[PDB]
Design a protein around this ligand. Structure first.
Ligand SMILES: O=c1ccn([C@@H]2O[C@H](COP(=O)(O)OP(=O)(O)O)[C@@H](O)[C@H]2O)c(=O)[nH]1
Ligand SMILES: NC(=[NH2+])NCCC[C@H](N)C(=O)O
Length: 303
């Protein structure tokens, strides 16, 4: 079609053409279980992840493919990627530390003390003292722990999947202009404030994706088994840098103590923006936001 309507509001279908880079990501806690001249991306039998991107990149030799990486990498491991970039020159390895996220950041001192004030400003007979006293101990712990400690800094490598699911959302905010910001070669063909298509390393290209159309230029993976529909972070495709729906999620992250990239940033951001007042069902959003492609065997890690 040319559009789709949700919550009574109308939403045009927006193009994501074959310029639009595929993004994969690998945040690796333990680089030293790799060879120091091995590509520090996993290719195990159960998770032959280094293999899934290459085949992706081969199936799409004429759209850019980004590999969003992060971890304390040996010089030789960085040149394993280097070989990977010249041996296949649509692949672009991008180090998380080579991007500046200061414009999207916030201090937990700030974030906590905000909520402390909000709660203290409410009636004592209404208010969440149980929460009121948790944010203050969180407060008490960050002061001692470090004063200048932030949202971004918190979702660190020590923190498990939050480490990479948080920075994912940031990446997409920066979109295709991030190929430029790290300085990656042969990316002049990317359009400015242009989108991207993140993919779990396990979503399998089989055939070409071509030119995608989306409601407002955004869609995410939705899983449906056996009957339990959820939103998934394992595909995220936007048509531009700093898409609003994710922007709203970054605000919720700013305005919530203990925000979660999955619960708050991804899920509620999308849906509040698409459905601020919850007039359509959850599922009826899941359907509306679902990313459909027959040429990808979705989320093969479940097998
Ligand atoms: O050590 C890890 C583990 C996972 N991931 C990211 O998590 C995505 C999906 O993980 P997977 O399908 O293995 O786990 P699931 O979420 O499906 O259990 C991967 O493509 C990676 O981008 C990562 O960066 N480092
Ligand atoms: N975004 C995603 N596809 N996440 C993975 C969900 C599937 C998960 N591997 C399972 O045991 O079912």
């Amino acid at each position: 079609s040319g559009h789709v309507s949700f919550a009574g509001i109308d939403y045009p279908l927006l193009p994501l053409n074959h310029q639009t880079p595929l993004v994969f990501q690998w945040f690796e806690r333990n680089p030293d279980r790799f060879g120091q001249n091995e590509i520090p991306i996993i290719n195990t039998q159960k998770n032959p992840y280094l293999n899934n991107i290459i085949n992706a990149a081969i199936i799409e030799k004429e759209r850019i493919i980004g590999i969003f990486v992060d971890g304390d990498f040996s010089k030789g491991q960085r040149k394993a990627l280097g070989k990977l970039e010249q041996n296949y020159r649509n692949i672009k390895v991008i180090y998380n530390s080579d991007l500046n996220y200061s414009m999207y950041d916030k201090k937990l001192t700030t974030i906590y003390l905000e909520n402390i004030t909000k709660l203290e400003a409410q009636s004592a007979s209404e208010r969440d003292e149980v929460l009121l006293n948790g944010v203050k101990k969180s407060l008490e712990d960050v002061l001692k722990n470090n004063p200048e400690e932030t949202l971004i800094s918190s979702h660190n490598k020590d923190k498990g999947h939050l480490w990479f699911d948080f920075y994912r959302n940031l990446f997409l905010l920066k979109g295709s202009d991030a190929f430029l910001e790290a300085g990656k070669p042969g990316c002049h063909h990317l359009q400015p404030g242009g989108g991207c298509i993140y993919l779990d390393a396990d979503m399998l290209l089989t055939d070409k994706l071509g030119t995608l159309y989306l409601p407002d230029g955004i869609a995410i993976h939705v899983s449906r088994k056996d009957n339990h529909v959820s939103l998934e972070n394992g595909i995220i495709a936007v048509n531009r840098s700093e898409h609003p729906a994710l922007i709203k999620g970054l605000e919720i992250m700013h305005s919530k103590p203990y925000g979660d990239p999955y619960n708050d940033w991804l899920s509620k951001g999308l849906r509040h923006y698409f459905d601020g007042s919850h007039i359509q069902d959850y599922d009826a959003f899941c359907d509306f936001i679902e990313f459909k492609h027959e040429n990808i065997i979705m989320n093969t890690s479940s097998l």
